[PDB]
Amino acid sequence: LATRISNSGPISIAAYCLSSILMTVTNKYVLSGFSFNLNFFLLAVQSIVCIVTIGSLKSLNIITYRQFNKDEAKKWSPIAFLLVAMIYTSSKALQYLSIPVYTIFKNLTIILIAYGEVIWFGGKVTTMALSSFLLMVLSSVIAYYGDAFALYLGYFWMLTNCFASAAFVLIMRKRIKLTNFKDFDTMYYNNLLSIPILLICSFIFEDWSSANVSLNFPADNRVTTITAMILSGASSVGISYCSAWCVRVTSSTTYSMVGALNKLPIALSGLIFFEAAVNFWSVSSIFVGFGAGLVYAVAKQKQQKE
Amino acid sequence: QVQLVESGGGLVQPGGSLRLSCAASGSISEINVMGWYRQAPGKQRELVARITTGGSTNYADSVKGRFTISRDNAKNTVYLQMNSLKPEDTAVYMCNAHRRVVMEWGPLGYDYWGQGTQVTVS
């Protein structure tokens, strides 16, 4: 059964939304009092947690993946460099821009990945599929509507994230095909190589002064900080496997569209389990986003039969 | 992105009282923790209190049972009621606000600091 599920399109999609829901729940509802402004060092800790998680499973003879290779780490380096490139540019994008404006631009990259898969991987973008891309941007625009230099750097660091996010999936999906990598080989290399880069970025681009260190690691609460630093990285194990799983089987476009649809369950949860407003500009954002997913799904059915 | 303005500091006799305030501004939906710090002259920052959206309050032993941090979601303000102020409580009190945002590879945190209100007890 481990093989039929491995080459399953719907299952990789469902497991990706579950792992994204689980990771967002942990970092937003389970860890609500957590404060940590050393971003790259905490993300480097996450990659350490995923490395020891699957490295111990393989050492227990449960799972299995390829041995580390010098000539194959040198060929995965561009993908690991791009993965940290999205991390750095998005952190710098959110220091001047908000989350609603970040999602507007992130839903404008699916139109760029969809048209990059056509050029590089061959194919076509149908009109039904295109109209679903504009219906995810519409839902973002509706949701959003409900210093001059600073806002120039907001869109500069946001267009660079658009290019790094699009290049990441297109280059990565190509490289899982000349290497015949499985979902554990991709997870192993995506994390092993990203540890040194994220640690080096945390050295130069983050504050390691005596006052910021004691503000991030208080001496009177060390078990709480270490525990929250590991629960924050144990929830990313599922999304690290299911991101590479989804990209391999379905597409870079489908993986990106599913990622955009992964933020609608969170929005609906706020409107029911929390106090979030139920105004027209927040209900019609969820309904329009659902129509975008249901139009993309039928669009691929027609494309499958065309 | 997020701006904090503090008001309430001043000179109070020993054993007196003081209430500090800290109004947030900007994007106030991603803020999860907001607290108070003090920097005695010649020393580094110390924690005075901490509150989160959910009312979980963290204090310091030296001020436990005296200071009371509270929040007001109507105007996004945090107060700090400082009773029985001994002279060792003189410092510059600063506000904090943590912005946490979650995306497809992990969370991100941004700390915003207020302006600082000088509190002198004598």
Numbering used by the authors:
A (entry chain A): 48 to 193, 203 to 362
B (entry chain B): 0 to 121
Quote what the paper states about this structure:
GDP-mannose is a nucleotide sugar metabolite that serves as the substrate for glycosyltransferase enzymes that build the fungal cell wall. Nucleotide sugar transporters operate via a strict antiport mechanism, moving nucleotide sugars into the Golgi in exchange for the free nucleotide monophosphate, which is released back into the cytoplasm. Here, we present the cryo-EM structures of the GDP-mannose transporter, Vrg4, from the pathogenic fungus Candida albicans, in complex with nanobodies, in both the Golgi- and cytoplasm-facing conformations. NSTs consist of 10 TM helices that are arranged as two inverted topology repeats of five TMs, such that TMs 1–5 can be superimposed on TMs 6–10 via a 180° rotation in the plane of the membrane.
We identified four nanobodies that exhibited the ability to block the uptake of 3H GMP into liposomes containing CaVrg4, with two nanobodies, NB3 and NB4, showing full inhibition of transport function. Nevertheless, we determined the structure of Vrg4 in complex with NB3 at 3.0 Å. The CDR3 loop of NB3 forms an extended beta-hairpin which extends 23 Å into the GDP-mannose binding cavity. The loop region of the CDR3 hairpin interacts with regions within the binding site that are important for GDP-mannose and GMP recognition. Specifically, Glu104 in the CDR3 loop forms a hydrogen bond with Tyr311 on TM9, which plays an important role in recognising the ribose group in GDP-mannose and is essential for transport activity in S. cerevisiae Vrg423,24. Sitting next to Glu104 on the CDR3 loop is Trp105, which is located close to the conserved (F/Y)YNN motif on TM7, responsible for guanine recognition within the NST family. Interestingly, Trp105 adopts two rotamer positions, with one rotamer engaging the guanine pocket and the other packing against Ile134 on TM3. Both rotamers would aid in favourable interactions to secure the CDR3 hairpin in place. However, NB3 makes several additional interactions with backbone carbonyl groups in the loop between Tyr76-Phe87; this region of the C.albicans protein shows a high level of sequence diversity across Vrg4 sequences and hence, while the CDR3 hairpin interacts with highly conserved regions of the transporters, it is the CDR1 and CDR2 regions that drive specificity in this nanobody.
